[PDB]
Design a protein around this ligand. Structure first.
Ligand SMILES: O=C(O)c1sccc1S(=O)(=O)NC1CC1
Ligand SMILES: O=C(O)c1sccc1S(=O)(=O)NC1CC1
Ligand SMILES: O=C(O)c1sccc1S(=O)(=O)NC1CC1
Ligand SMILES: O=C(O)c1sccc1S(=O)(=O)NC1CC1
Ligand SMILES: O=C(O)c1sccc1S(=O)(=O)NC1CC1
Length: 358
């Protein structure tokens, strides 16, 4: 590998792993469009299994980037429109507070205060209906952003309804398969169990628990190789042969709302490049990332901007992941760890690496 990449990655990640007591980690750097891979530590401490380029990690909320792109693909197919009222796809949703809440609002967390999680009590389809029918918004639609699995999770479920496919079938056949992400899963199959890392939370081995809208909001597992390929595909969508998927990638990086220096895409979030590193690092802290923030509508949305820092953090109980890229520089990074360690540490390391290579 190029020594500059070797050196910047090792000198950044080694101390991170030590300081954060991360059991296992995989990193990919995409540099002038080519991936370079690095691994450390253990996928399974008890069984002494090392992290490899084939190890599966829980992506947590990085999954939202796949949901956003799948939704974009459905727009490009003419199956849905972001301007469609939510009720068009869920006619049983008759409660008056849904008037004016569109698929755009669901996808971008701007519906007016849908909650961070779907309640664990929701264990059926009728339960889910009751939950959304009874939810009372704090704010008018399109006025404030509040990061929420119940928001983008419902968007994902509704976006695939016209296709007739389950969310998992749609994702597999329309996103994973065309991009040759052959080791990326919503449900880990028995064939891949030997590669599925344990997550570690307070030293205990854990995997993500089932929940309503899990697939749509936080449910994807993938390897460092497939995630490198996901980054390549989002860096350079015009190289994708399937037209609707190329278009879906473009739509997911369009800029729909602004708060501070950040622009909200579908799943992806973006800042102008060059970025103030303090903006992305401090901004990634959940104390900020999960706050209720007033948004400026971008009317109409700005198509995907090349000179952007495009990124997404994600976690589950036992895993912590980060992906960032800069289309203008053909540069990107994926960091997958089997411990949920603080977001700002991820973004600081990612910026130190990409800044050195830019
Ligand atoms: O992370 C921790 O708190 C702890 S505490 C005990 C084990 C672990 S761990 O195995 O998950 N961490 C890795 C460095 C050894
Ligand atoms: O610009 C606006 O009108 C609005 S209105 C609500 C948010 C914003 S903003 O965050 O993009 N601008 C803030 C930093 C000054
Ligand atoms: O990108 C957008 O937001 C939009 S929204 C309408 C068209 C476009 S685009 O043509 O510039 N690029 C992708 C959709 C086909
Ligand atoms: O993924 C994330 O970063 C975030 S940030 C806020 C919620 C979530 S999540 O619910 O999907 N995962 C939780 C266990 C850490
Ligand atoms: O199981 C996990 O790791 C995840 S990942 C996202 C939520 C959960 S959960 O089931 O604990 N729900 C709690 C965080 C609010």
């Amino acid at each position: 590998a190029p020594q500059q990449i070797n050196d910047i990655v090792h000198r950044t990640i080694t101390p991170l792993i030590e300081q954060q007591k991360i059991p296992g980690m995989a990193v990919a750097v995409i540099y002038q469009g080519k991936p370079y891979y690095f691994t450390w530590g253990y996928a399974d401490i008890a069984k002494k299994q090392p992290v490899t380029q084939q190890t599966l990690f829980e992506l947590g909320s990085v999954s939202k980037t796949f949901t956003g792109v799948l939704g974009g693909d459905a727009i490009a197919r003419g199956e849905i429109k972001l301007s469609d009222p939510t009720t068009k796809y869920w006619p049983e949703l008759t409660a008056k507070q849904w008037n004016g809440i569109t698929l755009l609002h669901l996808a971008t967390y701007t519906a007016g205060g849908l909650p961070l999680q779907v309640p664990d009590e929701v264990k059926s389809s009728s339960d889910l209906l009751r939950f959304y029918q009874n939810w009372q918004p704090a704010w008018a639609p399109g006025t404030q952003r509040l990061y929420a699995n119940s928001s983008i999770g419902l968007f994902g479920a509704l976006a695939v309804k016209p296709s007739g496919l389950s969310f998992e079938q749609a994702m597999q056949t329309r996103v994973f398969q065309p991009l040759k992400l052959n080791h990326t899963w919503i449900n880990v199959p028995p064939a891949e169990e030997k590669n599925y890392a344990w997550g570690y939370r307070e030293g205990k081995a854990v995997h993500v628990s089932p929940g309503a809208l899990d697939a749509e909001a936080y449910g994807v597992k993938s390897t460092i190789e497939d995630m490198a390929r996901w980054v390549q595909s989002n860096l350079k969508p015009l190289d994708i042969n399937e037209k609707t998927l190329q278009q879906g990638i473009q739509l997911a990086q369009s800029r729909y709302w602004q708060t501070g220096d950040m622009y909200q895409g579908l799943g992806w979030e973006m800042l102008d490049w060059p970025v103030n590193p303090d903006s992305i690092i401090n901004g990634s802290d959940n104390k900020i990332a999960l706050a209720a923030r007033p948004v400026k509508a971008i009317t109409p949305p700005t198509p995907a901007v090349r000179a952007s820092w495009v990124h997404k953090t994600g976690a589950t109980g036992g895993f912590g992941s980060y992906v960032a890229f800069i289309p203008e520089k053909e540069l990107g990074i994926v960091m997958l760890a089997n411990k949920n360690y603080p977001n700002p540490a991820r973004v600081d390391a990612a910026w130190q690496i990409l800044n050195a290579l830019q």
